[PDB]
Amino acid sequence: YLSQPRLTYKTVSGVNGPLVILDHVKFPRYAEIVHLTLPDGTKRSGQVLEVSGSKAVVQVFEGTSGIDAKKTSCEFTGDILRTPVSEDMLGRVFNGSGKPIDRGPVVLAEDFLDIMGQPINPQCRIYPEEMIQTGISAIDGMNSIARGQKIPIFSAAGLPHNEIAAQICRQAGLVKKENFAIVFAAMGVNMETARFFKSDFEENGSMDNVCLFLNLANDPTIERIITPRLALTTAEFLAYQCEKHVLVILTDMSSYAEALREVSAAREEVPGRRGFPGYMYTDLATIYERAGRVEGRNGSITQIPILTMPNDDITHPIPDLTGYITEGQIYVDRQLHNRQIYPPINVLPSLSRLMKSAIGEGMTRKDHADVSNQLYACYAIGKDVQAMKAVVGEEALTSDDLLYLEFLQKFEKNFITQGPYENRTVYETLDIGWQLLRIFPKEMLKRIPQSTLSEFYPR
Amino acid sequence: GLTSEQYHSQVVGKIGYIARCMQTIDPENNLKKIREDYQDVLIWAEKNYRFEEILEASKSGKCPNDLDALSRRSLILQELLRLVSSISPFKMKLDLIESQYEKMKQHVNLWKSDYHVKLNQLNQLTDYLKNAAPTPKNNFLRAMTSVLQMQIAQYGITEDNEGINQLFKLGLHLLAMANEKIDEQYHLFKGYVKDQPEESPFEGILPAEDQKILVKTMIDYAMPKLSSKVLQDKLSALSSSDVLTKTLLDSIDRIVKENEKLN
């Protein structure tokens, strides 16, 4: 424990944007937290952005407006940003920097953990295996998520990815044929969406599992930077120490990347690709890879980063590096959104690399893989048949083509189309899938082995 | 490829290695032809030149420093040393050693030679047997490999001896054969014994104790199939034998066949 008194400096050499450049610092520490009192008594926090000689460049969380030399004091806490973590922060709403915003008390620490964490040992990580059910059919019966997977949601501005995220937070759980928890982090989220998330989780009775970190768009961007690290430190505590399967939903990694760009510019680093930092890949990896199962512990951390693909460009650096680091993608389609389907999840471009580990006998059911494959094949064939009908006309189509069109319609109206508050267990999802597959006779279901068709097709 | 300093260090080291190989192969200075051929490199080892002095000589060119020629000659010597070592217990006549050295020298490329491949196979067998625990397969492999070493010493590797080729083939096949395939191992050994022209393949090659162990192993495999107690006692009497013989194996086979017919 640090027993020595904290040193307070009035030696402000200069202020430049968000930086207070203090001088005559006694052994400045990089990443040190420092609380500065302005001339009128306002208290702000800050982080030692750069250390040189006896100087200390302190990025102030709030702005530098009103700060002055000769009167502004800064007390150096003597330690890097350490968060207080406990189980009691399950059922709480915190801001980006951890201060509760639910009118509850400050967290009574079970431990004081460094937010940056350490990289989970590759030799200690274990393959995710079992499935975490999100209650959404389009990502349960077609893009199931394994316990330990990192599967982002891709979407554009205006699409209901935040509503899908809230639905996943409310409905997520184990397959269930109190060791589950959800850590929702929201970054660069306007006040309206932040209030929506908070009130929705409070009202729908799932808050007992959910730890909510909110970083409003107008909150400090450095707070936006440290929000995902707070969320994932809490997730690591709950999963690898309390041994409960944690689902981390990080919202607006694009806003996080904007905050990262701002911090890089403040550091005076030249822009990299497409104006973003060159190390954004390392930063996003540091965030994502704090996930997965581990050896000798019964907890896990599933991650579902949510991205706002700018200009709907999958080649943009943020989605590109996210695809490089993660293990799938759930696409939110503007076409389906305009057609008024909820959730507007496109299942053709979407993918979940570890669906085979997520599904199967003893995890979801015997027929999950076959049903999912046949549904995907029939859906693709239905889109193809629609395109063909656009040219040849309805009459020229054959009976199989009519069946495929019917299955397409009923699959987008019963499987995809869910409703915000319709929680489907994976068994309900597979039953709906079989209802849709029974449109076709047993023969055209070529991707379902006869062993499974003879058992699940009837009725 | 090599800086000048490292190249001349390689020359010095190769001269030293050739000297060591000569000392190991012919400690008694009986390989006069080979030593005469390697005289120009062995002169620097006979006297007590220090590494620095021999390196200076190599740089000056006084000592042989064509590293490619040194490598060729060192390989010619080293393959002969490997041949002599792989049959360590069975010495090779000086005439045969000299003839084999001449053949290796005449060969265009040793590292792609049939002699090199045969030595590699024999070294496979010898390395395995150097640490393999006593079991039926390992005893069989040791017997066949000892006979192979005797045949190599008496004939050599620079020819197409059908016996040596058969021994190599069968030994490698048994080595590759799975440990648990007891029946296949025993039948392979039986086939070798039956196809050996001599009546007593292992007489004089292996020690009498190893002969006894081999016959005991054969009797152990033969016993569980017997049913008649009289023939079982006959089998024990045969197991009392101290040397393996083709006729003894045939007698054991006939005993088990009579038991089968009686069944």
Partner: protein, 47 residues
Amino acid sequence: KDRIEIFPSRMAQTIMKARLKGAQTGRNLLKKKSDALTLRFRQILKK
């Protein structure tokens, strides 16, 4: 010629990506039309 001669820009890139997707979709639809016509053509040939 080799290029459409639209000045490089992100807007130009978006326009060209949209045009490429549209051309590919039209090519696929015309290919399906050709497939239907060829199927009927071979059926009539056999008839």
